[PDB]
Design a protein around this nucleic acid. Structure first.
Ligand SMILES: [Mg+2]
Ligand SMILES: [Mg+2]
Ligand SMILES: [Mg+2]
Ligand SMILES: [Mg+2]
Ligand SMILES: [Mg+2]
Ligand SMILES: [Mg+2]
Ligand SMILES: [Mg+2]
Ligand SMILES: [Mg+2]
Ligand SMILES: [Mg+2]
Ligand SMILES: [Mg+2]
Ligand SMILES: [Mg+2]
Ligand SMILES: [Mg+2]
Ligand SMILES: [Mg+2]
Ligand SMILES: [Mg+2]
Ligand SMILES: [Mg+2]
Ligand SMILES: [Mg+2]
Ligand SMILES: [Mg+2]
Ligand SMILES: [Mg+2]
Ligand SMILES: [Mg+2]
Ligand SMILES: [Mg+2]
Ligand SMILES: [Mg+2]
Ligand SMILES: [Mg+2]
Ligand SMILES: [Mg+2]
Ligand SMILES: [Mg+2]
Ligand SMILES: [Mg+2]
Ligand SMILES: [Mg+2]
Ligand SMILES: [Mg+2]
Ligand SMILES: [Mg+2]
Ligand SMILES: [Mg+2]
Ligand SMILES: [Mg+2]
Ligand SMILES: [Mg+2]
Ligand SMILES: [Mg+2]
Ligand SMILES: [Mg+2]
Ligand SMILES: [Mg+2]
Ligand SMILES: [Mg+2]
Ligand SMILES: [Mg+2]
Ligand SMILES: [Mg+2]
Ligand SMILES: [Mg+2]
Ligand SMILES: [Mg+2]
Ligand SMILES: [Mg+2]
Ligand SMILES: [Mg+2]
Lengths: 187, 105, 159, 147
RNA sequence: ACCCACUAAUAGGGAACGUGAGCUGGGUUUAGACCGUCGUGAGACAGGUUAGUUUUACCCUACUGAUGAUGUGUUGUUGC
RNA sequence: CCGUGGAGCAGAAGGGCAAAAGCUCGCUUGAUCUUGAUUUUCAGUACGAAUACAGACCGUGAAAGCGGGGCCUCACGAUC
RNA sequence: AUCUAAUUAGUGACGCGCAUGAAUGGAUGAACGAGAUUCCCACUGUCCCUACCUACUAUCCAGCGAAACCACAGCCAAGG
RNA sequence: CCCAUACCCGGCCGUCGCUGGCAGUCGGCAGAGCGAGAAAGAGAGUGGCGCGGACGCUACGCCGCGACGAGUAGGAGGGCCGCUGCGGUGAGCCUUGAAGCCUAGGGCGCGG
RNA sequence: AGCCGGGCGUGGAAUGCGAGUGCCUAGUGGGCCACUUUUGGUAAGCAGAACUGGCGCUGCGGGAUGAACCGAACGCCGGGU
RNA sequence: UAGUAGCUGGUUCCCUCCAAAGUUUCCCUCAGGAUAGCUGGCGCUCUCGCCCGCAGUUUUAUCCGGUAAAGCGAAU
RNA sequence: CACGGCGCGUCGCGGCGCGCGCGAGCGAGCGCACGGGGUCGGCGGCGAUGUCGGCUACCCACCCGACCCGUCUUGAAACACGGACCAAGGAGUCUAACACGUGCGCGAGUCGGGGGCUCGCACGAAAGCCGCCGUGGCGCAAUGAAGGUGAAGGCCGGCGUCGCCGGCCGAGGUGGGAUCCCGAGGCCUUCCAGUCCGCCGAGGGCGCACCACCGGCCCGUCUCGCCCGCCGCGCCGG
């Protein structure tokens, strides 16, 4: 008999991608080897992010990437994102960038290639920089999904700006009792 | 009974909906039959246009669509008269004609 | 069941001490509370304006807002299985500076001073408060008088 | 598929994952949205405030087509025309400005949100906003109304 | 409970307030009725009154009796 | 003359109160308009009640100030 | 009061009637009643207190043959 | 002195943790290491005969160390557990005997 | 009071231990018992509370027997105590 | 019309891991629900191989109280 | 006595401590074992129609243990209920909606589901194609009951006690932040000069996502106050 608790004995993190495609699994093999036979933690972070799910790999926009690479000090370094690089149409001037991503939108790829940059895939990234020196690791906005507007402190409760679940927006849908001081109460 | 959190729903299945159900298992057969009838009529009218009579230019009657142009029901009598076409001969020579439409412009 | 009145069961908690009724001494009114002082709550029944609820009596909080006559303070309250840091407004009579913080402040000043000193001397000095160590060996000198016997006394009834 | 569902793993457990004390009865709380104000009041108030009551005016024969008015923003404003148009206007020296008609592309009102690149534009629309107007004027350009 | 008589004495109790596939069914306690009190009424009354189907054992055990079994080689007589 | 409250403060009780919160006069209507925050039951939701503010119009006083109902703890009510 | 040795029964009176009473009928009453009660004569196995006899069964045999019921089953005392 | 499923030592199963190790099978074109108390190069350079060497690695694999293992209601995972039919595949099986059924026979798996 | 800039590491009690955070969510909403405290009751294997631990959900050694007591909580085995 | 049932009865293979509640508030609510609480699953953000935090524990300081006890030569 | 060379020995207190050179930090073999988990390079018998082995499984005996399951229940072996036995059948399914988590394609877009074109037709009622068939849905803008309105700005020259035109720069700030950049110093062997390449690393940078906080902008509403525009100078508009 030992006075211990087994509730949190097992950790929940992912050991391998839930996906079944073969290209991602080959990438996982390569980066598993790199992470376990290299002291650099960039490989560990990249492999962990390869394991993650789709909603945990949000797309990164061209405007975000250029904005985060225009910061001082990080010139002529390769921007690495484990998600999808999507094009942003509300930006005219695009510089030359050295991008690496699993997949890139067709229009975004056309824009970068026209601007003069080059697109890399995580394989060739391994060949170029195994330990990943000169890399700027970016990611898309994880809280960008609209489901996060429904989360948190419940609506109809003071100081809670949480979106309710309504089938249609209008004046006849959840506007009368809990939303007005004129009818009952106002939270 | 409501669960923790979710949407209030109003499913309209409080009638005997299972007696009036329209399955679409005859959709491909319907498409085949419509096609066959279409080609049969096209063969029946030998040199005539398969689509039918020509139709006129009309503007959609709404703020939402008044920028678009449709195909109308038929040419009106003012247009036929000013084009020199008899209202009775237009139909037999292939012009769709209706007398309801006016011409404000 | 019980009653949910705001002052239920406070006949001794909000009462005044023996032979201490009457005019509130003015020193309580003439103290300065700034933003961030650690302060004690003790409801005084002499004044009824801005009296804290009975569940904060004897609790210590942190001042976060200062106002003409009252002070807003953040204090922790244990509600079932969770603790809420909630902010309440108390008039200045029912409040009192906590002396638990000034001791630590004085200790900070003093050990900072003794750290600044002896820095040039290079000697070692202890700052952490070690717990009471076990007593060290020593000698107990008898002065020629032998210790006297102690014996239990016989039982004999009093009442 | 029925292969992967919880029922297959539940065979042999008398109870079927619904408890022994409180069984799986027919409708313990009432059907549908019953008791919204009586015994589901806490849930309704906590998760759907404003459900009960009336507010606003009644409009009987509503026609969405009258109020149809799609909007566009200035950051998207240059995407209505081809890129070659914009670059030609950019390297043009005569000062001529391209004409962008949002009604042709299916927008009625122009709202001014994004930053506008510094080149003259002739924006013709049906409705404008004050900030969009001032953005166009500041960048240099013209605002034209159409019906 | 009370009384009459005898007696030696007419002590007190338990056993699912022993005992209804043992009896009886007078009483409680269905449905029919009557009276008194209560209720506007249908009706109510630890109020009174009258009439109101009491099913089954061949099973197991228990018990009462009746064959028999058990070892002494087989049987029989007399016996403890 | 003595008188620490042994009286009174609308009401139950408890707390509180002496150049006052009691008694008597003077003048008044902060029991007025308005947005937020907080406490009490609490799910930390409403109602009710209450607490500090802030913005105007005022009352009172020589003034500092005090006052947006009753010295505090109770006297009250969603949708349509 | 009578009836008996003995009477919570019956009858006849008494009436302060918990709560009798006049076509929600009061009182009486010949004849009648598979109506409800008490007493007396006669008669008797109802009983003291049981016994014997007859017929059909039950019993055994030839033939023919179900059903109720059945967790497993079936010797007791005490304990829990 | 006696003994519990408790405690100590040992074996075995499984779970969890180390988000541990292994692509270095680098071979006459080679040189067999990265267990060793001390953050980091068996560093590269310039001047004063016999032809030879086990296993491995379904990487969704293999291997090494520790700790742990009760369970109703309930939740989750893995089943090379099972039943019926469909698309593929086994140059599959079968009148020299399929399905089904019976068995004091030989076995496998903790179990289905 | 808020802002900037600058200097100070002996990380200022003991002991132990990775921590924080977000969704979705079943069952439950009849309880009972014991030391101590305690209300009603003559009292009860009665009725009602507070704290902790148990039983329920739990087998094992002991109390002959036993939901709760004493010891001790459990993968399949050998040895020892 | 397979009418409704907050009420009985039943609810079909194996192993592995985790593991409860009969309590709060509201309800013509009291054999039932909703809501907190207790559970599981899925993760994610970092961490060590100088330092961060946390604790059903103690220590050093500092406040809070009106029970056990005691008192009536002190108030009631 | 886990003492053992020679020196230059101050590297020194008076010698010991304790430094600098000595082809420059390379002596080799054998052997025994209380040494990173057992071996014997030790043996003996009995084997053809009566004997050898067969955990389990067939029957039987013995010792210990052992109450009949399912169910409701605080509590079941219960003097609680269902159950004589056997075979077959037998109960969380399908549609719609919603939410969330996961896998795939495309991505500010996305989706032909309806229709049409494909010599209709074993499969094929499938599959392919439409792109001037994206009507349309969802998303890209919110807010207000409605009329309606509808999402940054920061610096210099031109009249700080600037009216007001240009030159610009551009979508905030603080704290914490995985990673990356730099890098004082530091990683060896005859010495010595002197490199290359790679690893280490004080401190210092740029700081993803995300959290907290402070600002800013859009719509409704309230308070205060001034200014500006004209096709119609007004109960106008900003
Ligand atoms: Mg264990
Ligand atoms: Mg868990
Ligand atoms: Mg539920
Ligand atoms: Mg279960
Ligand atoms: Mg239920
Ligand atoms: Mg249901
Ligand atoms: Mg009997
Ligand atoms: Mg009778
Ligand atoms: Mg009767
Ligand atoms: Mg017989
Ligand atoms: Mg006065
Ligand atoms: Mg004011
Ligand atoms: Mg007054
Ligand atoms: Mg008689
Ligand atoms: Mg009489
Ligand atoms: Mg009468
Ligand atoms: Mg009369
Ligand atoms: Mg009468
Ligand atoms: Mg016979
Ligand atoms: Mg062990
Ligand atoms: Mg287990
Ligand atoms: Mg058999
Ligand atoms: Mg229940
Ligand atoms: Mg009790
Ligand atoms: Mg437990
Ligand atoms: Mg136990
Ligand atoms: Mg005993
Ligand atoms: Mg043992
Ligand atoms: Mg049914
Ligand atoms: Mg019920
Ligand atoms: Mg029940
Ligand atoms: Mg008390
Ligand atoms: Mg006492
Ligand atoms: Mg035995
Ligand atoms: Mg039952
Ligand atoms: Mg239970
Ligand atoms: Mg019974
Ligand atoms: Mg029952
Ligand atoms: Mg039965
Ligand atoms: Mg079957
Ligand atoms: Mg849900």
């Amino acid at each position: 008999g030992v006075d211990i608790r087994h509730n949190k004995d097992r950790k929940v993190r992912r050991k391998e991608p839930k996906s079944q495609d073969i290209y991602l699994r080959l990438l996982v093999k390569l980066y598993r080897f790199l992470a376990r036979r290299t002291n650099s933690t960039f490989n560990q972070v990249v492999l962990k992010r390869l394991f993650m799910s789709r909603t945990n790999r949000p797309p990164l926009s061209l405007s975000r990437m250029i904005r985060k690479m225009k910061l001082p000090g990080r010139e002529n370094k390769t921007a690495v994102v484990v998600g999808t690089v999507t094009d942003d149409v509300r930006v005219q001037e695009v510089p030359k960038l050295k991008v690496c991503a699993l997949r890139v939108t067709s229009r975004a790829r056309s824009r970068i290639l026209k601007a003069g940059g080059k697109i890399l895939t995580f394989d060739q990234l391994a060949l170029d920089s195994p330990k990943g020196r000169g890399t700027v690791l970016l990611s898309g906005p994880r809280k960008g999904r609209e489901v996060y507007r429904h989360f948190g402190k419940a609506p109809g409760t003071p100081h809670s700006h949480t979106k309710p679940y309504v089938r249609s927006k209008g004046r006849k849908f959840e506007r009368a009792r809990g939303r007005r001081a004129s009818r009952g109460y106002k939270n | 009974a409501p669960s923790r959190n979710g949407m209030i729903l109003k499913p309209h299945f409080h009638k005997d909906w299972q007696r009036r159900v329209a399955t679409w298992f005859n959709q491909p057969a319907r498409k085949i039959r419509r096609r066959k009838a279409r080609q049969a009529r096209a063969r029946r009218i030998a040199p005539r246009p398969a689509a039918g009579p020509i139709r006129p230019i009309v503007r959609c009657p709404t703020v939402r669509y008044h920028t678009k142009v449709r195909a109308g029901r038929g040419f009106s009598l003012e247009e036929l008269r000013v084009a020199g076409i008899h209202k009775k001969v237009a139909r037999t020579i292939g012009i769709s004609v209706d007398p309801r439409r006016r011409n404000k412009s | 069941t019980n009653t949910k009145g705001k002052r239920r069961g406070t006949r001794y908690m909000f009462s005044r001490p023996f032979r201490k009724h009457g005019v509130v001494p003015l020193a309580t009114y003439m103290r300065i509370y700034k933003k961030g002082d650690i302060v004690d709550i003790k409801g005084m029944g002499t004044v009824q304006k801005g009296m804290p609820h009975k569940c904060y009596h004897g609790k210590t909080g942190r001042v976060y807002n200062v106002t003409q006559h009252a002070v807003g303070i953040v204090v922790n309250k244990q509600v079932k299985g969770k603790i809420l840091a909630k902010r309440i407004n108390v008039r200045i009579e029912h409040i009192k500076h906590s002396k638990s913080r000034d001791s630590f402040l004085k200790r900070v000043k003093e050990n900072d001073q003794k750290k600044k000193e002896a820095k040039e001397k290079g000697t070692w000095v202890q700052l952490k408060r070690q717990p009471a160590p076990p007593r060290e060996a020593h000698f107990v000198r008898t002065n020629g008088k032998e210790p006297e016997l102690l014996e239990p006394i016989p039982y004999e009834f009093m009442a | 598929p029925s292969r992967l569902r919880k029922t297959r793993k539940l065979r042999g457990h008398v109870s079927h994952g619904h408890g022994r004390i409180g069984k799986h009865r027919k409708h313990p709380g009432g059907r549908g949205n019953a008791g919204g104000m009586h015994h589901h009041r806490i849930n309704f108030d906590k998760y759907h405030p404003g459900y009960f009551g009336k507010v606003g005016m009644r409009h009987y024969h509503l026609k969405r087509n009258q109020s149809f008015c799609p909007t566009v923003n200035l950051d998207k404003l240059w995407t209505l025309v081809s890129e070659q148009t914009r670059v030609n206007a950019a390297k043009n020296k005569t000062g001529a400005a391209p004409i962008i008609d949002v009604v042709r592309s299916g927008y009625y009102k122009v709202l001014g949100k994004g930053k506008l690149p510094k080149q003259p534009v002739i924006v013709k629309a049906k409705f404008f906003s004050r900030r969009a107007e001032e953005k166009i004027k500041g960048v240099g350009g013209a605002c034209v109304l159409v019906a």
